[PDB]
Amino acid sequence: ATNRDQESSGFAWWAGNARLINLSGKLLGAHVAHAGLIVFWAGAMTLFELAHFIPEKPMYEQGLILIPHIATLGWGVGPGGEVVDTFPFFVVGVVHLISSAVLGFGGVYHAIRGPETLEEYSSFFGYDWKDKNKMTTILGFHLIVLGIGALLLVAKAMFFGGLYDTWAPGGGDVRVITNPTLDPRVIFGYLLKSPFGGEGWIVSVNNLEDVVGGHIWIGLICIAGGIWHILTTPFGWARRAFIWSGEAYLSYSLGALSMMGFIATCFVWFNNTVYPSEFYGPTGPEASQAQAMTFLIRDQKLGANVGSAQGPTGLGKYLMRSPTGEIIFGGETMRFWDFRGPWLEPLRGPNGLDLNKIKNDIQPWQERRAAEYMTHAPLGSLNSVGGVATEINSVNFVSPRSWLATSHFVLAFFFLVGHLWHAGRARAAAAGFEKGIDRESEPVLSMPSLD
Amino acid sequence: MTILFQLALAALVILSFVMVIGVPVAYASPQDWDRSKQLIFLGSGLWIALVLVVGVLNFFVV
Amino acid sequence: SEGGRIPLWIVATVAGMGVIVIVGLFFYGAYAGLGSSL
Amino acid sequence: KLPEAYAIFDPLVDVLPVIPVLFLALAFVWQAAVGFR
């Protein structure tokens, strides 16, 4: 046993994986085995959901998060997001589950049987963390790999059946994307949009043309960057700006994943295009607006003039203006006037909600949709009692939007913590005091007093 | 074909279980490593084979 | 009689699994019978 | 549900997603075996 106790490694059991920092073979085992864990989960969870899946219930009433993802890609669903074939889900789950056996095999092999170090074994697979060039090279490889992934999405969208489009004219459906947005002005224009209300940065992407074009851009960008990094070594300013050690790169990736986690949280919370409400349930905004729509409809049916109806506050009971004049649902749902959804937009005119369309053009499918979304608002208890916190037991429901948003906030946050921990440690270790202050060389003791 | 299927799949499960315990135990055991390497190769090829058999037979039973 | 005959990591593993089983049972009971709301 | 042909495997399938957590627990069993050295 080499380096598998504290005396020899300097790391206690609870920091055990740091014993792997410089054991590239065993460390590869750790990584591949871990990827095994991820694919394993994708597969087993998918099979579970499917075994548990009742096709005539909406997915979001059944606690599904993965089936919604497969379905978003256009597999197994038709018009309105209705399930027409569960077999594609079965395939995804099974193929993941099988692949996981392979990753686990390689991982375990590398972890306990394979070479502890790869450097004497192979110069290509071996690496020194401080070897900046080998690092940007491996990074480059993974960048080309990710780019290929994004283009796999593009392929699914353009040549292998398309994607689920909640916005499809005449109603949501799987649709082939023939004209993805290539214009760099629009695509990077998203990246320069405000993250505040009514702009919502990248989260505002509201059509599949933009999604697919964006991924064309991203694929080509990532492959180009990867090639770039195989063919180059880091410039002087980069050499002088960063820490070059395993733990440091780790800290950087932790930071990035943290950032991405928060982005995903908001994505699943607000976006109903790449997270169609048919599969994931309504957004909070969608549902508040849906309440307003529902009662506007009800009372107008009862004979109410909803345009001229003055609420208790002086604001319109049903309809009022946004701070820029757009006609919006009134009451508290005023905050959500930036909401956009396929069921509401036909009621939308140049100036916002059109009173004549409201009076004359509301179709039964809109009332139905509004009622469904209103009553499947993303509210629920930890034990999954649906509705407001004071609601009685009856409904077994927590929106998938809440599960996914909350999970990723908790995770993104702890990864930010991990980022801080490991970036600060990489700094201390690089500078040589991560284990504490030299008693005979206490830096502060050589500093002048402050006063 | 359901007999072939349901038993090829049961055998896939059983063999999977066997590999799951056996492979790490083999990998970390000092003796009988020569015999282990070949048993693991056999088990692996057989596992792959059963996956493919179940996979094919799938379409004649669903 | 002799101390050491049954290794501590097994006692710990068994005891731990026992706690997981019993607690797990309590959580099952949260969804069935009394207190299940049904 | 799974295809009818696979229905006999429901109970097994019901259990699978939790195994990853078992790998975390296994790490502790293993460490217990080497005395957390």
């Binding site: - | 279980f17 315990i21 970390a28 055991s29 | - | 109970p11 259990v15 195994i19 627990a25 075996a33």
Partner: peptide
């Protein structure tokens, strides 16, 4: 229900079995 507790019994025991067998054979733990 009996089948489910049997499955998780075999899956559940598997890890500790790996550890036990390796410890018995003085394996590379």
């Amino acid at each position: 229900v009996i089948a489910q507790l049997t499955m998780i019994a075999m899956i559940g025991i598997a890890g500790p079995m790996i550890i036990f067998l390796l410890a018995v054979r003085r394996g590379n733990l």
